[PDB]
Design an enzyme around this catalytic site. Structure first.
Site, short mmCIF file in Angstrom:
data_model
loop_
_atom_site.label_atom_id
_atom_site.label_comp_id
_atom_site.label_asym_id
_atom_site.label_seq_id
_atom_site.Cartn_x
_atom_site.Cartn_y
_atom_site.Cartn_z
N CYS A 273 -5.79 1.22 11.13
CA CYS A 273 -4.27 0.81 10.82
C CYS A 273 -3.22 1.12 11.98
O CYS A 273 -3.43 2.00 12.46
CB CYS A 273 -3.95 1.49 9.50
SG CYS A 273 -2.39 0.91 8.72
N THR B 91 0.76 -0.97 -0.05
CA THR B 91 -0.03 -0.02 0.01
C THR B 91 0.92 1.14 0.11
O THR B 91 0.37 2.48 -0.51
CB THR B 91 -1.05 -0.01 1.11
OG1 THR B 91 -0.60 -0.27 2.46
CG2 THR B 91 -2.33 -0.93 0.54
N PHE C 170 -7.37 4.89 6.27
CA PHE C 170 -6.92 4.12 7.22
C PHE C 170 -7.87 3.30 8.58
O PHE C 170 -7.58 2.66 9.31
CB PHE C 170 -6.05 4.67 8.27
CG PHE C 170 -4.66 5.43 7.61
CD1 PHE C 170 -3.77 4.71 6.95
CD2 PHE C 170 -4.72 6.82 7.39
CE1 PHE C 170 -2.61 5.29 6.27
CE2 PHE C 170 -3.52 7.50 6.60
CZ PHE C 170 -2.74 6.51 6.12
C1 HEM Z 1 -0.84 4.44 3.16
C2 HEM Z 1 -0.35 3.19 3.53
C3 HEM Z 1 -1.39 2.33 4.10
C4 HEM Z 1 -2.82 2.24 3.98
C5 HEM Z 1 -3.62 3.04 3.24
C6 HEM Z 1 -3.30 1.10 4.96
C7 HEM Z 1 -4.67 0.87 5.25
C8 HEM Z 1 -5.27 0.16 6.26
C9 HEM Z 1 -6.59 -0.24 6.60
C10 HEM Z 1 -7.78 0.38 5.57
C11 HEM Z 1 -6.70 -1.22 7.40
C12 HEM Z 1 -8.17 -1.64 7.85
C13 HEM Z 1 -8.95 -2.87 7.03
C14 HEM Z 1 -10.45 -3.40 7.62
O1 HEM Z 1 -10.86 -2.82 8.33
O2 HEM Z 1 -10.68 -4.57 7.03
C15 HEM Z 1 -5.49 -1.43 7.81
C16 HEM Z 1 -5.24 -2.22 9.13
C17 HEM Z 1 -3.80 -2.69 9.42
N1 HEM Z 1 -2.53 -2.16 8.91
FE1 HEM Z 1 -2.42 -0.57 7.17
N2 HEM Z 1 -2.17 0.73 5.60
C18 HEM Z 1 -1.28 1.23 5.19
C19 HEM Z 1 0.49 0.96 5.75
C20 HEM Z 1 0.60 0.03 6.59
C21 HEM Z 1 2.05 -0.19 7.27
C22 HEM Z 1 3.24 0.54 6.99
C23 HEM Z 1 1.57 -1.21 8.29
C24 HEM Z 1 2.99 -1.89 9.14
C25 HEM Z 1 4.17 -1.56 9.34
C26 HEM Z 1 0.46 -1.50 8.22
C27 HEM Z 1 -0.29 -2.63 8.94
C28 HEM Z 1 -1.73 -3.00 9.51
C29 HEM Z 1 -2.02 -4.08 10.26
C30 HEM Z 1 -1.27 -5.18 11.09
C31 HEM Z 1 -3.78 -3.95 10.27
C32 HEM Z 1 -4.78 -4.62 11.14
C33 HEM Z 1 -4.93 -3.96 12.56
C34 HEM Z 1 -5.94 -4.56 13.45
O3 HEM Z 1 -6.89 -4.97 13.12
O4 HEM Z 1 -5.46 -4.93 14.77
N3 HEM Z 1 -0.30 -0.88 7.13
N4 HEM Z 1 -4.63 -0.58 7.14
#
Ligand code: HEM
Ligand SMILES: CCCCCC/C=C\CCCCCCCC(=O)O
Length: 454
Positions: free
Chosen positions: A397, A265, A390
Site C-alpha cells: 500500500c 478502507t 497492507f
Molecule cells: C487502513 C486503510 C488501508 C488499508 C487497510 C489498505 C490496504 C491496501 C492493500 C491490501 C493493498 C494491496 C492489494 C493487492 O496486492 O492486490 C493496497 C495498495 C494500494 N493502496 Fe491501500 N489501504 C488503506 C489506505 C489507503 C490510502 C489512505 C491510500 C491513498 C491515499 C491508499 C492507496 C493505495 C494504492 C494507490 C495501492 C496500489 C499500490 C501499487 O500497486 O502501486 N490506500 N492497499
C-alpha cells in the site's frame, strides 16, 4: 513427498459453485478453511484458484523471485472503470513503474507535516456536529465516518471541498460507487452471464460509471481556472528513469483510483475500533486516560499525535481481527514446488485469505478471538509475515502512513471530548462490497463540556 491437494465436494458441470450462494462470500470461505486446513483448490466453470491460510505457506508465496502480483476475477471487473492506474495495472505495464516514481514524493515526512493543518479542519467540523445534537437524538456511525474520510482526501490531495457535513443524505458520488462495487461482487456467482435476464444490470452499471467521471471533469476545471500536492505532480512531474510524463488518459484513471481507495478502507477501520471499545470497558477506560494526559491544548499538534502510544495499539488489533481489504492474489513466474509437496505450472493462481492468517494458533496462542491491544507492546518481537493488513513487497500500500496519522488524530479527539453509550445492545452484522464494514451500528454521546480552538 508429493501429496494430493484437498478440495470440497463437486456437483457435475456446476463444480464447487453451489457452495457460495450468498451476499457474504469471504465469511463463507472462512468456514470451508476451518474444515479442511491450511490449503484447498476451488473450481467454477471456466476457471481455478488455490486458497492459503497458514504462516509457513504464505512466507513462501511472498518470495518476489518466484511469484508476482495477479489480477483476480474481482479486480478484472473493476479495471472496466479504473483502467491502468496504480491499483489495477500489471507490474510489467509501462505505466506502473513510471506513476510509482512520479507520485512517491507526495508521501514523505516533509509532505506529511504539510497535510496536518487541513486534517484538523475536517476533524473540528465532526466534534461540532455531535456537540449540537438534542437529548432525544443518536449517531449513525459508518455514515459520519465516510463524511470525514472523503472530505479529507478531497482537500489534502486536490484542494477541492465536497462539503459533506452540509447535507443529511449521502453524497451522490458515494451512492453510485456502492452500487458499482456490489454489481462486481454479484457477477462472480453467475453461470451464464450473457443471457437476456441480466440486460438491466448492465445498463445500470454504465449509469453509475458516468456519474463518477462527471466529478473528475469538475476537479480538472477548477485547477485549470484557479499548490504543491498530488494533483501538481500528476500534471507536471517527470520519471527520472525514462524522462517521460503521464498522458491525459492515464491521469483520469489516477483521479478515480485515489478518491475510492483513498477513503473507503479508512472509514471501515474507525467503525470496528469504536465497536470493540464499547464492548470492552476496561480497555476504553485506559485509552481515555491517555487522551486527557497527552492533549493539553485547544487543538492537537503534529508531535502530540506521535505520543498517543496506546491508541495505536488499539488500531492495529482491530486490523488483526477485521482487515478492511481482506484478500490479495498471486501467480507463478515459472514451474516450481510449494512447501516441498505441491508441484505448480507456469501461470497457476494463489489467494491469501488475510483473516485466517491472523488466527494461526501456532503463532498467536489459543485465545485468538479476544480483543487485547497489549499483544502489540513490543512490536519488534512478533514474527515476519504474521501480520499483513497492507499487502507485500514492491506492490504494498502507498498510503499506509497517511491513513494511520488520520485515524490516530480523530480517535483521540473523540475520546477527549465525550463519554459513549451502547443504547440498543448492538449485534455485529458485517456487510461485503468486496471491502468490509459493520452495517447499522448506532450510539449515543454525552459531552464533557470542554472548549475547542481556532
Ligand atoms: C487502513 C486503510 C488501508 C488499508 C487497510 C489498505 C490496504 C491496501 C492493500 C491490501 C493493498 C494491496 C492489494 C493487492 O496486492 O492486490 C493496497 C495498495 C494500494 N493502496 Fe491501500 N489501504 C488503506 C489506505 C489507503 C490510502 C489512505 C491510500 C491513498 C491515499 C491508499 C492507496 C493505495 C494504492 C494507490 C495501492 C496500489 C499500490 C501499487 O500497486 O502501486 N490506500 N492497499
Ligand atoms: C479502486 C477499486 C477498489 C478496490 C476494492 C477491492 C479491494 C479488496 C478485494 C477483495 C476481494 C475478495 C473477493 C471475494 C470473492 C470470491 O473470492 O469469490
Amino acid at each position: 513427498t508429493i501429496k494430493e491437494m484437498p478440495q470440497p465436494k463437486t456437483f457435475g458441470e456446476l463444480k464447487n459453485l453451489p457452495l457460495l450462494n450468498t451476499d457474504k462470500p469471504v465469511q463463507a470461505l472462512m468456514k470451508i478453511a476451518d474444515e479442511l486446513g491450511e490449503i484447498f483448490k476451488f473450481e467454477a466453470p471456466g476457471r481455478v484458484t488455490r486458497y492459503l491460510s497458514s504462516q509457513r505457506l504464505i512466507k513462501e508465496a511472498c518470495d518476489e523471485s518466484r511469484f508476482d502480483k495477479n489480477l483476480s476475477q474481482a479486480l478484472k471487473f473493476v479495471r472496466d472503470f479504473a483502467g491502468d492506474g496504480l491499483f489495477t495495472s500489471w507490474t510489467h505495464e509501462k505505466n506502473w513503474k513510471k506513476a510509482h516514481n512520479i507520485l512517491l514524493p507526495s508521501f514523505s515526512q516533509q509532505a506529511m507535516k504539510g497535510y496536518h493543518a487541513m486534517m484538523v479542519d475536517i476533524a473540528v467540523q465532526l466534534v461540532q456536529k455531535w456537540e449540537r445534537l438534542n437529548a432525544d437524538e443518536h449517531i449513525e456511525v459508518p455514515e459520519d465516518m465516510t463524511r470525514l474520510t472523503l472530505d479529507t482526501i478531497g482537500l489534502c490531495g486536490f484542494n477541492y471541498r465536497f462539503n459533506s457535513f452540509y447535507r443529511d443524505q449521502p453524497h451522490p458520488f458515494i451512492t453510485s460507487m456502492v452500487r458499482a462495487l456490489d454489481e462486481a461482487m454479484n457477477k462472480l456467482q453467475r453461470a451464464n452471464p450473457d443471457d437476456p435476464a441480466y440486460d438491466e444490470n448492465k445498463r445500470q452499471f454504465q449509469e453509475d460509471i458516468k456519474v463518477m467521471n462527471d466529478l473528475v471533469d469538475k476537479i480538472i476545471a477548477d485547477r485549470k481556472a484557479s499548490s504543491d500536492d498530488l494533483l501538481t505532480h500528476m500534471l507536471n512531474g517527470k520519471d527520472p528513469e525514462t524522462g517521460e510524463p503521464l498522458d491525459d488518459e492515464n491521469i483520469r484513471y489516477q483521479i478515480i483510483t485515489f478518491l475510492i481507495m483513498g477513503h473507503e478502507t479508512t472509514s471501515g477501520l474507525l467503525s470496528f475500533a469504536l465497536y470493540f471499545l464499547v464492548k470492552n470497558p476496561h480497555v476504553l477506560q485506559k485509552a481515555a486516560e491517555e487522551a486527557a494526559r497527552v492533549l493539553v491544548d485547544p487543538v492537537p499538534s503534529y508531535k502530540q499525535v506521535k505520543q498517543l502510544k496506546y491508541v495505536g495499539m488499539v488500531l492495529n488489533e482491530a486490523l488483526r481481527l477485521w482487515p478492511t481489504a481482506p484478500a490479495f492474489s498471486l501467480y507463478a513466474k515459472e514451474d516450481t514446488v510449494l512447501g516441498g509437496e505441491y508441484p505448480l505450472e507456469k501461470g497457476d493462481e494463489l489467494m491469501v485469505l488475510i483473516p485466517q492468517l491472523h488466527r494461526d494458533k501456532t503463532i498467536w496462542g489459543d485465545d485468538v478471538e479476544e480483543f487485547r491491544p497489549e499483544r502489540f507492546e513490543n512490536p519488534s518481537a512478533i514474527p515476519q509475515h504474521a501480520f499483513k493488513p497492507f499487502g507485500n513487497g514492491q506492490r504494498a500500500c502507498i498510503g499506509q502512513q497517511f491513513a494511520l496519522h488520520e485515524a490516530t488524530l480523530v480517535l483521540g479527539m473523540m475520546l477527549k471530548h465525550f463519554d459513549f453509550e451502547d443504547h440498543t445492545n448492538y449485534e455485529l452484522d458485517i456487510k461485503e462490497t468486496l471491502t468490509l464494514k459493520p452495517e447499522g451500528f448506532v450510539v449515543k454521546a454525552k459531552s464533557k463540556k470542554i472548549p475547542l480552538g481556532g
